[PDB]
């Protein structure tokens, strides 16, 4: 075998509407836990993205 990999940019794009989703989480909840949780899992979207998918 030989050579290499990585490649591996890897980050960003944007959560713009997911930012919207964050503030959305903020609006209701009213037992905020679910809101913040979801919003966080979203916020995740390199690694950590996949991480929050736990």
What does the alpha-carbon distance between residue 1 and residue 47 come to, in Å, rounded to a whole number?
27
> Per 3-state DSSP, what percentage of the chain is helix, strand, and coil (rounded to 5)?
55, 0, 45
Alpha-carbon distance of 15 to 48, in angstroms, equals: 14
Tell which phi-psi region holds residue 10, choosing left (phi > 0), alpha (psi between -120 and 50) or beta.
beta
CA distance 34 to 44: 15
Is the separation of the CB atoms in 29 and 35 below 8 Å?
yes
Method: cryo-EM
């Amino acid at each position: 075998n030989k050579e290499m990999d990585d490649v591996k940019v890897a980050s960003k794009k944007l959560p713009v509407n997911q930012m919207v989703l964050k503030n959305a989480w903020d609006c209701s909840q009213q037992r905020t836990k679910e809101d913040w949780q979801e919003w966080i899992r979203r916020l995740s979207i390199e690694s950590s993205s996949h991480a929050l998918r736990a």
